[PDB]
């Protein structure tokens, strides 16, 4: 069985694809080898190998994630100031990340504690550890050990399943079994397990810390043995979320444990219900969507939506102790999950297109013109409406006519449904604050919030237009009637019919990545400006609030010039003036590098490969002149690869620019 696991193919690069068997005649062979590496569908051998590869690769990636978790745990146990952060979280910035004293890189470590200098981490791992009752270094040691053991176990399982599974293997196709066991045993039987963990280790510990005994009598009290504290020790009646814990500025962990217990019960009951529930309508979906790419797209869309829900729920539904006051942590936790939501949504669209090209589509593709046409009209309507309210405000403010602009002190567009959406939270008529820092105050939504929400809707709709147009017009179109034979990813069909560049679903993803990036850059900026202007900030003992941006949002965000001046210029002073400043030197440098990479992408985005091919031939003349012949013949990047490289550099550079801009400012202000 395992005697066929041989290294003889390690030296034979490109073995998996039969199109690469001719050998590396040109440099295009290298890029094709890298491109087809994970494309198990088109690789050689039967369908059973596809299942084995998919499952074992999933296990290998799971081992990789476990290794990353183990690295974070070891950094927290042996390369961090988590001790002093535990003792005083409101005066110590989290830091489990040092820099070596080479090339003066010592300037990157900054004062986080009197005994520690390092890079302020914004992953929120310290708050997670405190919410996980991790106090001693031994606990982090054993967490790291368990994560390393999990890495080894998952790696070994990925190794084994390449030969345990065979041609007869069918457990992956049993979707009823997968859904039932997943749902019940994981969402139900593991949620209650975490509820048990919290009830037996957090409530014995986190109340002890909040009770002021950071000593906890060392292990005499902290090491469990506290069955005289009661599970609902400090619920204080009320409703979950209406009253926060005054000490840690978060929801009481007893309520979180009850939530996990009840959610596990609900999931178990739903698994029991699924024995007899509503069906026979999603049944066409049931039979037509049993394929790798469709389920991958469905899961990607679902996980991305969950990621955006997490992004919006991690900030002003504070669960973690001492996390609402840690403003850089809140900002990072929102924005990182926002970006992941966008990226995984785009991936869902791509794999929907791939499923359409490999499998057979459904009924909705036959009236695709009305669908992707009313989508076009709605995109045009909300683009010519949302953005232009900004253009109108801008023009009339430049003209000196502020009474004719869309503002609160002018023609005002009230957010009617949001203002009547006091259902969410429904907190008492005041704010909450822990230590000179605002925990959460209700965002008073006005005209600017209305306009920016419509901008969000417009960008979302345009990205969805690109994605659905790629998906629905994958097999064929009025433009080209045999797009199915062209495959999933192709540069074009030729300069004929006026020009057929970028008709493939791959190119539709290529444009959709740009539009998703543009969509949630505005989301990032809206969050980053709104929180600073209207939520975060200092306090005055006379109940007066001094925010970080001093309420710039409601008065400046009504015009594009307001965004340019009060957000991208005034709030970029921290990152731009960050040279020789200990903590924020890398952020200024990375700001510069992000600008460089973003501009560098434009060389690939704007140019075609024929010019570069001719230039490469001109250079190859000089190489052949001096008897330097590369027998792997130099070829310029393929059209699809040029577009991919351009998109990757564009998004990476822009994301790095925002990343530095937000993080350096929040680190300086805090």
């Amino acid at each position: 069985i395992f005697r066929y696991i041989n290294t003889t193919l390690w030296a034979k690069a490109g073995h998996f694809n039969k199109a690469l068997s001719k050998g590396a005649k040109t440099t295009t062979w290298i890029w094709n080898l890298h491109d087809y590496a994970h494309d198990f569908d088109i690789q050689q051998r039967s369908t059973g190998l596809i299942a084995r590869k998919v499952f074992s690769s999933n296990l290998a990636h799971l081992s990789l994630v476990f290794f990353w978790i183990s690295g974070m745990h070891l950094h927290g146990a042996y390369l961090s100031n988590y001790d002093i952060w535990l003792k005083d979280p409101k005066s110590i910035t989290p830091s489990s990340h040092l820099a070596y004293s080479l090339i003066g890189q010592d300037i990157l470590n900054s004062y986080t504690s009197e005994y520690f200098s390092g890079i302020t981490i914004t992953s929120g791992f310290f708050q997670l550890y405190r919410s996980e009752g991790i106090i001693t270094q031994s606990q982090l040691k054993y967490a790291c050990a368990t994560s390393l053991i999990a890495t080894l176990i998952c790696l070994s399982g990925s190794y084994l399943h390449m030969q345990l599974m065979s041609k007869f293997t069918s457990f992956y196709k049993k979707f009823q079994s997968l859904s039932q066991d997943h749902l019940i045993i994981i969402f139900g039987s593991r949620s209650t397990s975490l509820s048990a963990h919290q009830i037996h280790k957090m409530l014995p510990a986190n109340p002890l810390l909040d009770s002021g005994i950071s000593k906890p009598s060392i292990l005499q009290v902290i090491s469990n043995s506290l069955s005289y504290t009661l599970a609902l020790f400090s619920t204080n009646l009320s409703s979950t979320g209406k009253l926060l814990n005054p000490s840690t500025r978060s929801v009481f962990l007893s309520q979180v444990a009850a939530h996990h217990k009840t959610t596990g019960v609900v999931f178990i009951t739903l698994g029991l219900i699924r024995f007899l529930t509503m069906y026979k309508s999603q049944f066409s979906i049931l039979t037509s969507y049993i394929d790798y790419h469709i389920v991958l797209s469905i899961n990607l869309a679902l996980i991305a939506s969950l990621s955006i829900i997490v992004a919006d729920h991690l900030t002003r539904t504070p669960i973690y102790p001492h996390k609402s006051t840690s403003y850089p942590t809140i900002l990072c936790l929102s924005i990182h999950h926002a970006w992941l939501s966008g990226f995984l949504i785009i991936g869902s669209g791509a794999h929907a297109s791939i499923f359409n090209l490999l499998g057979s589509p459904t009924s909705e593709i036959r009236h695709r013109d009305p669908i992707y046409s009313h989508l076009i009209w709605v995109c045009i309507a909300i683009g010519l409406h949302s953005f232009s309210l900004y253009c109108h405000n801008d023009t009339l403010e430049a003209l000196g006519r502020p009474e004719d602009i869309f503002h609160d002190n002018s023609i005002q567009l009230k957010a009617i449904f949001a203002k009547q959406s006091f259902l969410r939270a429904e907190l008492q008529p005041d704010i909450e604050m822990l230590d000179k820092k605002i925990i959460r105050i209700t965002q008073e939504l006005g005209t600017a919030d209305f306009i920016v929400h419509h901008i969000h809707a417009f960008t979302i709709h345009v990205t969805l237009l690109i994605l659905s147009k790629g998906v629905l017009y994958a097999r064929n179109s009025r433009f080209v009637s045999d797009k199915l034979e062209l495959g999933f990813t192709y540069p074009c069909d030729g300069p004929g019919r006026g020009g057929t560049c970028q008709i493939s679903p791959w190119d539709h993803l290529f444009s959709a990545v740009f539009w998703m990036y543009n969509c949630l850059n505005v989301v990032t900026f809206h969050y980053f400006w709104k929180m600073q202007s209207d939520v975060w900030g200092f306090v005055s003992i006379q109940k007066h609030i001094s925010h970080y941006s001093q309420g710039d949002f409601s008065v400046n965000s009504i015009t594009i010039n307001g965004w340019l001046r009060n957000l991208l210029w005034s709030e970029a002073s921290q990152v731009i003036q960050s040279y020789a400043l200990s903590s924020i030197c890398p952020y200024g440098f990375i700001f510069l590098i992000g600008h460089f990479i973003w501009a560098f992408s434009l060389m690939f985005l704007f140019s075609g490969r024929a010019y570069w091919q001719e230039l490469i031939e001109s250079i190859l003349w000089s190489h052949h002149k001096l008897k330097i012949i590369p027998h792997i013949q130099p070829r310029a990047l393929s059209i699809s690869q040029g577009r991919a490289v351009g998109f990757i550099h564009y998004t990476l550079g822009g994301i790095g620019s925002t990343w530095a801009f937000i993080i350096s400012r929040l680190l300086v202000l805090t």
Binding site: T47, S170, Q176, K280, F283, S284, T287, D404
Partner: protein, 250 residues
């Protein structure tokens, strides 16, 4: 009958599960199951293990076999197979089980709207409720542009009255002089200007495209359309003036 489907031990697969497999699998595939089909594994094992053959297996081999066979719940029942065999029949017959999009999904309305039009290969004749229903057809036919028995000037007058009456509002309110004591004569002038501009555009259209669907027999081509556009301008003036009169008086 087929050789390997007879006297198959229950331990390899149960009787009801095997019958469910045979029902789900198309009849032509029983003799030689394809590959990666539960019936293929049933054939590849029932021809090795049985009464006259190897009657025992290693525990791990039997464990792997039990995870290659269906678990009696992942197979469509008779009613589900009927659902598919009839849904596909509807779809191929040119009829669509009517569904309406909802919150990321669609509700089936339990209606069979015949989908392909009179010209089945025509893309714009696929009949929908909003364009080919009785109400939609009679509403479109009764519009001023389509109403039977209307002289071209009557269509123009009606359309112009509608446009002129409506166009006053966006200017007299939220306009540059929305707060001035008059604030409505400005809106009247702007609405009349919009009516005149669109009437000029219609005249351009009638002198360039020259639609001939309103011309009476033996007339200068496009004369009906030009008359309709001129009377739309007149009706726009009238409707704008009437809206302004109502605003000022009331």
């Amino acid at each position: 009958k087929i050789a390997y489907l007879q006297d198959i031990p229950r331990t390899i697969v149960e009787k009801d599960a095997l019958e469910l497999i045979l029902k789900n699998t198309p009849k032509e595939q029983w003799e030689n199951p394809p590959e990666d089909s539960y019936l293929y594994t049933v054939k590849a094992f029932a021809e090795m293990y049985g009464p006259g053959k190897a009657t025992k297996m290693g525990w791990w081999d039997y464990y792997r076999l039990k995870m290659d066979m269906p678990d009696t719940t992942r197979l469509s029942s008779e009613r589900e197979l009927q659902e598919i065999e009839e849904y596909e029949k509807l779809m191929m017959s040119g009829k669509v089980p009517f569904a309406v999009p909802g919150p990321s999904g669609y509700f089936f309305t339990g209606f069979v709207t015949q989908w392909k039009g009179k010209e089945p290969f025509a893309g714009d004749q696929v009949i929908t409720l909003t364009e080919n229903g009785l109400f939609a057809k009679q509403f479109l036919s009764a519009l001023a542009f389509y109403r039977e028995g209307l002289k071209p000037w009557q269509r123009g007058l009606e359309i112009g009255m509608a446009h002129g009456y409506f166009l006053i509002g966006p200017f007299t309110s939220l306009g540059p002089l929305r707060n001035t004591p008059e604030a409505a004569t400005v809106g009247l002038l702007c609405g009349c200007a919009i009516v005149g501009i669109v009437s000029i555009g219609g005249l351009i259209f009638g002198s360039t495209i020259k639609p001939t669907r309103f011309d009476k027999d033996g007339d200068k081509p496009g004369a009906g359309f030009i008359e309709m556009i001129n009377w739309h301008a007149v009706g726009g003036l009238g409707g704008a003036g009437f809206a302004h009169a109502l605003i000022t008086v009331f």
